[PDB]
Design an enzyme around this catalytic site. Structure first.
Site, PDB file in Angstrom:
ATOM      1  N   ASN A 115       0.692  -1.201   0.086  1.00 61.20           N
ATOM      2  CA  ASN A 115       0.106   0.009   0.037  1.00 61.20           C
ATOM      3  C   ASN A 115       0.888   1.469  -0.058  1.00 61.20           C
ATOM      4  O   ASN A 115       1.978   1.317   0.595  1.00 61.20           O
ATOM      5  CB  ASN A 115      -1.037  -0.042   1.093  1.00 61.20           C
ATOM      6  CG  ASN A 115      -0.398   0.594   2.557  1.00 61.20           C
ATOM      7  OD1 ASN A 115      -0.464   1.799   2.574  1.00 61.20           O
ATOM      8  ND2 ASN A 115       0.136  -0.177   3.204  1.00 61.20           N
ATOM      9  N   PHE A 119      -1.498   8.272   4.207  1.00 58.41           N
ATOM     10  CA  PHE A 119      -2.382   8.740   5.232  1.00 58.41           C
ATOM     11  C   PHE A 119      -3.754   9.672   4.710  1.00 58.41           C
ATOM     12  O   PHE A 119      -3.822  10.969   5.007  1.00 58.41           O
ATOM     13  CB  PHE A 119      -1.592  10.084   6.014  1.00 58.41           C
ATOM     14  CG  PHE A 119      -0.386   9.461   7.087  1.00 58.41           C
ATOM     15  CD1 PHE A 119      -0.669   8.239   7.526  1.00 58.41           C
ATOM     16  CD2 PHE A 119       0.633  10.292   7.459  1.00 58.41           C
ATOM     17  CE1 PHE A 119       0.569   7.854   8.348  1.00 58.41           C
ATOM     18  CE2 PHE A 119       1.570   9.881   8.310  1.00 58.41           C
ATOM     19  CZ  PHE A 119       1.478   8.413   8.633  1.00 58.41           C
ATOM     20  N   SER A 185       5.520   5.312   8.735  1.00 60.79           N
ATOM     21  CA  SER A 185       4.801   5.222   7.468  1.00 60.79           C
ATOM     22  C   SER A 185       5.921   5.539   6.436  1.00 60.79           C
ATOM     23  O   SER A 185       6.883   6.359   6.398  1.00 60.79           O
ATOM     24  CB  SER A 185       3.812   6.233   6.941  1.00 60.79           C
ATOM     25  OG  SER A 185       3.237   5.889   5.779  1.00 60.79           O
ATOM     26  N   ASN A 187       5.212   6.234   3.276  1.00 62.87           N
ATOM     27  CA  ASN A 187       4.328   6.588   2.287  1.00 62.87           C
ATOM     28  C   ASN A 187       3.922   8.562   2.575  1.00 62.87           C
ATOM     29  O   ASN A 187       3.410   8.750   1.701  1.00 62.87           O
ATOM     30  CB  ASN A 187       2.986   6.054   2.135  1.00 62.87           C
ATOM     31  CG  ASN A 187       3.240   4.542   1.869  1.00 62.87           C
ATOM     32  OD1 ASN A 187       3.993   4.205   1.105  1.00 62.87           O
ATOM     33  ND2 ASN A 187       2.454   3.761   2.539  1.00 62.87           N
ATOM     34  N   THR A 188       4.873   8.857   3.494  1.00 59.60           N
ATOM     35  CA  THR A 188       5.013  10.411   3.715  1.00 59.60           C
ATOM     36  C   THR A 188       6.369  10.759   3.594  1.00 59.60           C
ATOM     37  O   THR A 188       7.322  10.238   4.552  1.00 59.60           O
ATOM     38  CB  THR A 188       4.236  10.623   5.037  1.00 59.60           C
ATOM     39  OG1 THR A 188       2.810  10.227   4.748  1.00 59.60           O
ATOM     40  CG2 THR A 188       4.271  12.205   5.243  1.00 59.60           C
ATOM     41  N   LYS A 225       5.733   3.648  17.137  1.00 57.94           N
ATOM     42  CA  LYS A 225       5.528   2.671  15.870  1.00 57.94           C
ATOM     43  C   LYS A 225       6.873   2.961  15.030  1.00 57.94           C
ATOM     44  O   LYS A 225       6.816   3.813  14.554  1.00 57.94           O
ATOM     45  CB  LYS A 225       4.176   2.702  15.345  1.00 57.94           C
ATOM     46  CG  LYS A 225       4.297   1.538  14.416  1.00 57.94           C
ATOM     47  CD  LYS A 225       2.695   1.302  13.854  1.00 57.94           C
ATOM     48  CE  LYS A 225       2.361   0.122  12.797  1.00 57.94           C
ATOM     49  NZ  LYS A 225       0.952   0.132  12.543  1.00 57.94           N
ATOM     50  N   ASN A 254       5.656  -1.148  11.493  1.00 59.12           N
ATOM     51  CA  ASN A 254       4.922  -0.844  10.232  1.00 59.12           C
ATOM     52  C   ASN A 254       5.324  -2.044   8.995  1.00 59.12           C
ATOM     53  O   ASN A 254       6.011  -2.852   9.350  1.00 59.12           O
ATOM     54  CB  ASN A 254       5.227   0.329  10.042  1.00 59.12           C
ATOM     55  CG  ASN A 254       4.100   1.511   9.535  1.00 59.12           C
ATOM     56  OD1 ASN A 254       3.671   0.876   8.610  1.00 59.12           O
ATOM     57  ND2 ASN A 254       3.803   2.431  10.168  1.00 59.12           N
TER      58      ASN A 254
HETATM   59  C1  LIG Z   1      -3.698  -1.040   3.440  1.00 60.88           C
HETATM   60  C2  LIG Z   1      -2.878  -0.583   4.688  1.00 60.88           C
HETATM   61  C3  LIG Z   1      -3.019   0.565   5.360  1.00 60.88           C
HETATM   62  C4  LIG Z   1      -2.094   0.813   6.423  1.00 60.88           C
HETATM   63  N1  LIG Z   1      -2.258   2.063   6.929  1.00 60.88           N
HETATM   64  C5  LIG Z   1      -1.623   2.277   8.273  1.00 60.88           C
HETATM   65  C6  LIG Z   1      -1.669   3.326   9.011  1.00 60.88           C
HETATM   66  O1  LIG Z   1      -2.336   4.446   8.793  1.00 60.88           O
HETATM   67  N2  LIG Z   1      -1.005   3.600  10.101  1.00 60.88           N
HETATM   68  C7  LIG Z   1       0.096   2.486  10.496  1.00 60.88           C
HETATM   69  O2  LIG Z   1       0.513   2.860  11.559  1.00 60.88           O
HETATM   70  N3  LIG Z   1       0.171   1.605   9.962  1.00 60.88           N
HETATM   71  C8  LIG Z   1      -0.642   1.384   8.988  1.00 60.88           C
HETATM   72  N4  LIG Z   1      -0.685  -0.079   8.216  1.00 60.88           N
HETATM   73  C9  LIG Z   1       0.503  -1.059   8.761  1.00 60.88           C
HETATM   74  C10 LIG Z   1      -0.254  -2.011   9.599  1.00 60.88           C
HETATM   75  O3  LIG Z   1      -0.843  -1.224  10.815  1.00 60.88           O
HETATM   76  C11 LIG Z   1       0.796  -2.979  10.145  1.00 60.88           C
HETATM   77  O4  LIG Z   1       1.705  -2.362  10.941  1.00 60.88           O
HETATM   78  C12 LIG Z   1       1.359  -3.999   8.924  1.00 60.88           C
HETATM   79  O5  LIG Z   1       0.358  -3.927   7.866  1.00 60.88           O
HETATM   80  C13 LIG Z   1       1.901  -5.111   9.245  1.00 60.88           C
HETATM   81  O6  LIG Z   1       0.769  -5.971   9.883  1.00 60.88           O
HETATM   82  P1  LIG Z   1       0.152  -7.128   8.845  1.00 60.88           P
HETATM   83  O7  LIG Z   1       1.246  -7.933   8.140  1.00 60.88           O
HETATM   84  O8  LIG Z   1      -0.656  -7.874   9.802  1.00 60.88           O
HETATM   85  O9  LIG Z   1      -0.705  -6.243   7.754  1.00 60.88           O
HETATM   86  C14 LIG Z   1      -1.271  -0.027   7.134  1.00 60.88           C
HETATM   87  C15 LIG Z   1      -1.219  -1.586   6.326  1.00 60.88           C
HETATM   88  C16 LIG Z   1      -1.859  -1.772   5.259  1.00 60.88           C
HETATM   89  C17 LIG Z   1      -1.695  -3.154   4.404  1.00 60.88           C
HETATM   90  O1  LIG Z   2      -1.319   5.593   4.856  1.00 57.95           O
HETATM   91  C1  LIG Z   2      -0.450   5.135   4.661  1.00 57.95           C
HETATM   92  O2  LIG Z   2       0.103   5.005   3.397  1.00 57.95           O
HETATM   93  C2  LIG Z   2       0.339   3.931   5.372  1.00 57.95           C
HETATM   94  C3  LIG Z   2       0.697   4.385   6.630  1.00 57.95           C
HETATM   95  C4  LIG Z   2       1.551   3.647   7.340  1.00 57.95           C
HETATM   96  O3  LIG Z   2       1.777   3.856   8.815  1.00 57.95           O
HETATM   97  N1  LIG Z   2       1.720   2.384   6.887  1.00 57.95           N
HETATM   98  C5  LIG Z   2       1.429   1.919   5.854  1.00 57.95           C
HETATM   99  O4  LIG Z   2       1.714   0.889   5.430  1.00 57.95           O
HETATM  100  N2  LIG Z   2       0.580   2.966   5.011  1.00 57.95           N
END
Ligand SMILES: Cc1cc2nc3c(=O)[nH]c(=O)nc-3n(C[C@H](O)[C@H](O)[C@H](O)COP(=O)(O)O)c2cc1C
Ligand SMILES: O=C(O)c1cc(=O)[nH]c(=O)[nH]1
Ligand SMILES: C/C(=C\COC(=O)C(C)C)CC/C(C)=C/Cc1c(O)c(Cl)c(C)c(C=O)c1O
Length: 366
Positions: A115, A119, A185, A187-188, A225, A254
Site C-alpha cells: 500500500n 495517510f 509510514s 508513504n509520507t 511505532k 510498520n
Molecule cells: C492497507 C494498509 C494501510 C495501513 N495503514 C496504516 C496507518 O494508517 N498507520 C499505521 O501505523 N500503519 C498502517 N499500516 C500498517 C499496519 O498497521 C501493520 O503495521 C502492517 O500492515 C503489518 O501487519 P500485517 O502484516 O498484519 O498487515 C497499514 C497496512 C496496510 C496493509
Molecule cells: O497511509 C499509509 O500509506 C500507511 C501508513 C502507515 O503507517 N503504514 C502504511 O503501510 N501505510
C-alpha cells in the site's frame, strides 16, 4: 478448525477479491464491519489469554492493526469480530486525500499487500466527534478488557511535525487508552527521518509533555511505532530515547520498503509498504532486538505477518506483550481472529505456559 474458517479462506474471500479492486474491497469491509454484518464469533476468550499491560486489562492479546479503520468508523464491529483491542488511524490533524488511486495492491501468491495510501484521513475533528459519540460505551468496553488505541499521523504539507503530533495528543488523547506516534509510514516524505535520535527525542519530549497535561482519567499511554527497515544504529538510538523519556511502549513493526528475494506477485515492484507473510520474520526479529535493547522493561505490541497462533506465539516469545494483524484478515476474512486465538491457546498449553503473560520474552530466557 471450523467450517467457517475453511469457507472464508478457500472460497468466499478469494472469490470476492477476484470481483473487487483492493480499495473498493477495503471500503466495503469497513462498511460491513461497522454495520455488524460479520459472522458470529464463536470463540469465548479463556483466562489464559488475558494480559495486563499499559495500565489496562486486555481480554485477549490479538488486536486489529492501524490502517484498517483509519477514521474510527468500525470500532464496535471490530470488537464483535473478537479482537482484544482496536487501534484506529492513522489520523492527521487536517483532513487530507492521500495518494492518487490505485494505491493498494494484492500479492496473492505471497499472501502480501503493498500500500501507498499516504495517510488518507478524515482529520482530527471528524474522528474526535465520531469517538465522542461512543466515549462512555468505550469506557465500559475498556473496563471490560477491550481497550482502544489511536494512531496519530502528520499532514503532507505541515511545516512542523512535532506540532501535528501534539495536536493529535490534545484532541484524541482524551478519547484513547493509548496513543501511537507513527513515525514509520513509508508513504509520507521525510516521516521516517523522525525516527533519528535528535529528532525523535525532541518530538517525543513534546508529545509526552502534551500527554502529561491531560486530566488523569483522560491520560493515555504513549507508544512509538517503528519501521522494520531500521539500521542497528537506529534501533540502539530509539531504545536509548525510549528509556531516557519513559515512553510507555513500542509497536513493532510498520510495513517494509524492502522487497525480500522470492516475491512472486506481479505487483511486487509497486511503490509502498509491504505487509503480510514476507514481513513476518523481519518483524519478529525487530521485536526480539527491541526487547533485548530495552531489557524487557518496555511493552511491545508485535505486528507484521501474523496469520496463525504460531505466528502470534513467535512474536510473544520474542518479546511482544500483545500482537496485531491486518493483512491476514484481508485474505482469510473474519474467521482468522478466532483461528489465531484458538491456536495460540493450544500452543501455550503444549509448551507448558500457564498463560500469555508467562510466554512474553520466553526465548530470551532459554
Ligand atoms: C492497507 C494498509 C494501510 C495501513 N495503514 C496504516 C496507518 O494508517 N498507520 C499505521 O501505523 N500503519 C498502517 N499500516 C500498517 C499496519 O498497521 C501493520 O503495521 C502492517 O500492515 C503489518 O501487519 P500485517 O502484516 O498484519 O498487515 C497499514 C497496512 C496496510 C496493509
Ligand atoms: O497511509 C499509509 O500509506 C500507511 C501508513 C502507515 O503507517 N503504514 C502504511 O503501510 N501505510
Ligand atoms: C466485505 C467483504 C468481505 C468480508 O470480510 C471482511 O469484511 C473482513 C476483511 C473484515 C468483501 C471485500 C473484501 C474481499 C475485502 C478484503 C480486503 C482486501 O482484498 C484488500 Cl486488498 C484490503 C486492502 C482490505 C482492507 O481491509 C480488505 O478487507
Amino acid at each position: 478448525a471450523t467450517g467457517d474458517e475453511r469457507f472464508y479462506a478457500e472460497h468466499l474471500m478469494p472469490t470476492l477479491q477476484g470481483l473487487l479492486d483492493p480499495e473498493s474491497a477495503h471500503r466495503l469491509a469497513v462498511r460491513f464491519t461497522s454495520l455488524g454484518l460479520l459472522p458470529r464469533a464463536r470463540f469465548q476468550d479463556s483466562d489464559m489469554l488475558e494480559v495486563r499491560v499499559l495500565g489496562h486489562k486486555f481480554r485477549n492479546p490479538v488486536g486489529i492493526a492501524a490502517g484498517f479503520d483509519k477514521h474510527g468508523e468500525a470500532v464496535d464491529g471490530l470488537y464483535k469480530m473478537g479482537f482484544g483491542f482496536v487501534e484506529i488511524g492513522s489520523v492527521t490533524p487536517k483532513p487530507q486525500e492521500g495518494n492518487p488511486r490505485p494505491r493498494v495492491f494484492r500479492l496473492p501468491e505471497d499472501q502480501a499487500v503493498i500500500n501507498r495510501y499516504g495517510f488518507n484521513s478524515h482529520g482530527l475533528s471528524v474522528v474526535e466527534h465520531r469517538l465522542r459519540a461512543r466515549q462512555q460505551k468505550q469506557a465500559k468496553l475498556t473496563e471490560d478488557g477491550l481497550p482502544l488505541g489511536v494512531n496519530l499521523g502528520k499532514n503532507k504539507t505541515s511545516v512542523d511535525a512535532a506540532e501535528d503530533y501534539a495536536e493529535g495528543v490534545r484532541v484524541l488523547g482524551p478519547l484513547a487508552d493509548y496513543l501511537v506516534v507513527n513515525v514509520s509510514s513509508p508513504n509520507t516524505a521525510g516521516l521516517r527521518s523522525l525516527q533519528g535520535k535528535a529528532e525523535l527525542r525532541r518530538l517525543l519530549t513534546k508529545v509526552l509533555q502534551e500527554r502529561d497535561g491531560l486530566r488523569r482519567v483522560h491520560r493515555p499511554a504513549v507508544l512509538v511505532k517503528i519501521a522494520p527497515d531500521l539500521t542497528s544504529q537506529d534501533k540502539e538510538d530509539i531504545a536509548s530515547v525510549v528509556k531516557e523519556l519513559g515512553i510507555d511502549g513500542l509497536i513493532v513493526t510498520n510495513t517494509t520498503v524492502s522487497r525480500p528475494a522470492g516475491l512472486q506477485g506481479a505487483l511486487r515492484s509497486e511503490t509502498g509498504g509491504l505487509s503480510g507473510k514476507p514481513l513476518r520474520d523481519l518483524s519478529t526479529q525487530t521485536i526480539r532486538e527491541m526487547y533485548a535493547l530495552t531489557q524487557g522493561r518496555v511493552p511491545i505490541i508485535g505486528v507484521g505477518g501474523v496469520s496463525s497462533g504460531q505466528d502470534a506465539l513467535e512474536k510473544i516469545r520474542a518479546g511482544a506483550s500483545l500482537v496485531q494483524l491486518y493483512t491476514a484478515l484481508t485474505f482469510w476474512g473474519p474467521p482468522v481472529v478466532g483461528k489465531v486465538k484458538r491456536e495460540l491457546e493450544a500452543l501455550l498449553k503444549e509448551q507448558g505456559f500457564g498463560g500469555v503473560t508467562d510466554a512474553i520474552g520466553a526465548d530470551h530466557r532459554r
